[PDB]
Design a protein around this ligand. Sequence first.
Ligand code: MG
Ligand code: MG
Ligand code: MG
Ligand code: MG
Ligand code: MG
Ligand code: MG
Ligand code: MG
Ligand code: MG
Ligand code: MG
Lengths: 206, 100, 127, 107, 79, 99
Amino acid sequence: GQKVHPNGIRLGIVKPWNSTWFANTKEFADNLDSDFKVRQYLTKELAKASVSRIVIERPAKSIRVTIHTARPGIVIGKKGEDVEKLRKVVADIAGVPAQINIAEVRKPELDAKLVADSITSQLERRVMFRRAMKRAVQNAMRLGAKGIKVEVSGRLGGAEIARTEWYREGRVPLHTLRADIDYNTSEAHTTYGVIGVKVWIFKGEI
Amino acid sequence: AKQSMKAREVKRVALADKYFAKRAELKAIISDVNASDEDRWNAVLKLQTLPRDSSPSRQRNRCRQTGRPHGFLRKFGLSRIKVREAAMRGEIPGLKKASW
Amino acid sequence: NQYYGTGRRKSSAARVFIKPGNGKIVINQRSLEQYFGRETARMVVRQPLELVDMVEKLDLYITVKGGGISGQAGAIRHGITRALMEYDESLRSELRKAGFVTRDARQVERKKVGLRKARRRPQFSKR
Amino acid sequence: PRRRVIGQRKILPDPKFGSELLAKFVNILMVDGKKSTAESIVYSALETLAQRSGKSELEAFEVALENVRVRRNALAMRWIVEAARKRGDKSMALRLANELSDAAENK
Amino acid sequence: RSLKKGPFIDLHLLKKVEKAVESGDKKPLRTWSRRSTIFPNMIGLTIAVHNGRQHVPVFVTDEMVGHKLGEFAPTRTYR
Amino acid sequence: QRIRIRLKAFDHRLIDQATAEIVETAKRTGAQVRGPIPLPTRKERFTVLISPHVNKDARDQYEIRTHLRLVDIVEPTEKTVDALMRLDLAAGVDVQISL
RNA sequence: CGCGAAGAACCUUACCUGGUCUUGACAUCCACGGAAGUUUUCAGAGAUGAGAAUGUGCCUUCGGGAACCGUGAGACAGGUGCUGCAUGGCUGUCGUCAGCUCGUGUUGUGAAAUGUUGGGUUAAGUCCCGCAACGAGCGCAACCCUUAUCCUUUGUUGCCAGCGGUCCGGCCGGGAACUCAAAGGAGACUGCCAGUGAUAAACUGGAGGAAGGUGGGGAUGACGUCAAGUCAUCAUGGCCCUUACGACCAGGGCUACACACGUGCUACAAUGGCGCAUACAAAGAGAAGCGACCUCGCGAGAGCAAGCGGACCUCAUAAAGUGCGUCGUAGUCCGGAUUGGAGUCUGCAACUCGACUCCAUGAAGUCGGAAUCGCUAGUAAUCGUGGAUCAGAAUGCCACGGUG
Ligand SMILES: [Mg+2]
Ligand SMILES: [Mg+2]
Ligand SMILES: [Mg+2]
Ligand SMILES: [Mg+2]
Ligand SMILES: [Mg+2]
Ligand SMILES: [Mg+2]
Ligand SMILES: [Mg+2]
Ligand SMILES: [Mg+2]
Ligand SMILES: [Mg+2]
């Protein structure tokens, strides 16, 4: 069956938006295209820095970007050198002067993107999909998750026929609107096609 | 769309602010003036020698991310599918699936 | 002494101002016969003042915005009944029996995706 | 209807005469939700039936109703309206008045 | 159809008329302007009107003034 | 004279927090304010396709809600102006001042 | 099969003809020459082949760097070309149908069964008894949003009861009551009563209440099924072309026409047609924009020219309906097709192929075979309005109310 996107359906009810900047009809189109350029640049430059969530908010004549990552030391660098090279080029893209804020992700196994990116990297390293699913589940439940399930689909292990398989531990309600559900999607680009990774993480209610 | 097709759209906009922004704006007014030059304004003939690709009627509003000429929205500047992928990841502020 | 009661419908909204003693009806600075073109709309506001007898006994000063022929007429009929409950407070047993105090909340059903109307589906082929 | 056994709606009666049965009669002739033009035809048809075709307007409709007999009253009123449309007279008020005249004299 | 403030004609075809009046009539003139309005200074000339793949010569007649050159060239072959 | 502040934002629970910070500051410094008024929400509604191909009937139903708040200040007291003009407010709130 | 395409006059456009280009229309790397840019110039359907004027910003351990133009070498670029029987993601469908499973115990050599066979009762695997099963999870339901009653907070651009003011306009003093506007909260939970039912769940009836038996509507669509749809949204394995399957431009085609099929609009009319008078909406849109008032034209519109980034101003006079008069059952004062003539507006440009107005013409059609579809209530039917797409181009689609 077809599933609705669980993170987008819960925006504003129990999940805050990843962008909260306001603008009227005049500058909304230019700034939204400016958001796509900065999210693509911070993902490409910091792909090995485990960046999972980018918060973009805009004051009246400025912009500050909050980078949620589990490894701040690559993002900070030696005394802010890596931050300084990023703050100068975001202001070139956005036009207004910019600022780089860094929020530390305490547990990467509870954030849905870094669980999906870890399985994305291991399937390229010839780690088995039975093992790759099993490590991310057990590491999340021991850190205080009430439930987690992960799904992979399409050419598992280089087989010709695409197959679907999902494992579940705990309790993950998809139809409860109070359910804190963290969901994001990552694709495993291997030599034998694309492997989709879906991660559902339940963090409690209300 | 194709990379050559988006290169055509940049070529039209760069000529649109070049030629038809201020020069054809004057030529549209003088041909419309009822008070003076009722017979021999000849502004239409000078518009003929201008290049065609400066026209706002020839340009096509397309997605800034992929280049799809279908499903454009002036609110987002994107195609209908790419609006969804930014909405579900929370990249568009305040945008959510609605019920009424 | 003013006695007030709010009545409404789908997109209407009516106020009711009661003053003791006349047979005067002033709706939007117009008369009862002048504003209401339909004879049925003239009588549906007389229906709550049937069990309770009015001849020349109370003023009503009413205005209404939005709605249509029976939307404005349904708004006034709801508005009079709350004014009589404000006026006497013992009349409720007759007004619950008539059913005029119940606000008709049947709003319009939304136009659905995939269908040209709320329930009307585009025409279907067997095979 | 297989499981959902419910009743049928009770509409408000005729504001002119206080007749519940005449309120169901004007809804059959009403097309495109035009209540204002439907009841004006029915009132003018009965006034032709009352003044020139026999007194007791409320009873004169009942004698025309009795010969063509909830559902028994529903099919009787529907047969009067549908047969009135396929006549040779000029207006709908003139056609339905002659149908109630024929139904009163069972022909 | 078109507004009365100026009948439209292309600039390149208008130049082809002016040299044809002074230097006399020539071989049929190949052009692509199917949208030009026929003026009375063109009567007598033969203009080859492009119709998609070839050029069809049209001998201009007196009553052709006001019409378009595209109204004399079928763009498709029917069988 | 009269100064007024138009407050507009996407989130309803976030616009009233920045609204309350301005009015409470204005009442503290001795200004005359006739409260905040709720102006009607201009909510846009967007219906676009979810599929790139046939099965036309499946669509998404989006909205953008734009709330509006107006605070009217009667007297231009210098202590009122110097406090309110450089406040630290939420990033998702746009301010419009009429002096 | 009004599907992708939310909108093919050029563009779009992937097609064809014809004219052209070859590190290329476009991106990264180096070197040299030109600051870039500006302004114009002659041929060509155009892509472009050749000239005039001008700046020279920035630091120059003077090597110039850097934007952009020009030239050149190769690495490379480019493809909407092949494959949805190499794939991701997403969607339809059964179906908002009530199913789908685990943990332990128990039964059987066993695959498994029980649970989750039965007795009831519900929209429901909904719930309660019964029972070697006891529990849990994914579904359903609930929580969310919106609407229906009341309260609190706040009165401008919104509102006008008691008041003063009349040029009869909330328009101006004012009033903060009320309508409306939106932030929070109360309120419905079989809660109470009666009866039925094994004292159960549940049902029936009644009261209270704005709302009563999941109040109305939406969001919310399980495991799976159809190798269903998508290499032409995008992402992507592999293959193929490369002075060509690429790229530029002009015109044409996508709108053809002996036919067939599906999907719509307007009709065949007196529940109507036309003329005059006239009343009542909700929801949105607006700055390279909506564009009032005034003036002109029969009109489409045009001129002049405010207000308004907007509860202010504009689109914007809602239409059905109501009142009077007329036509009197007919191919008609029905219905408007088609065609001619004369024009408006959009845009380099309305021939192929735009919209609209005016004059004139007035096809078929007088309720439609077999067959077949929608819908149980503010629904069907019908009336108009608005929006997205859009320079312009809605009988389609998305919303919104009126009557019902
Ligand atoms: Mg691509
Ligand atoms: Mg276009
Ligand atoms: Mg084309
Ligand atoms: Mg259950
Ligand atoms: Mg539910
Ligand atoms: Mg498949
Ligand atoms: Mg197939
Ligand atoms: Mg006619
Ligand atoms: Mg039903």
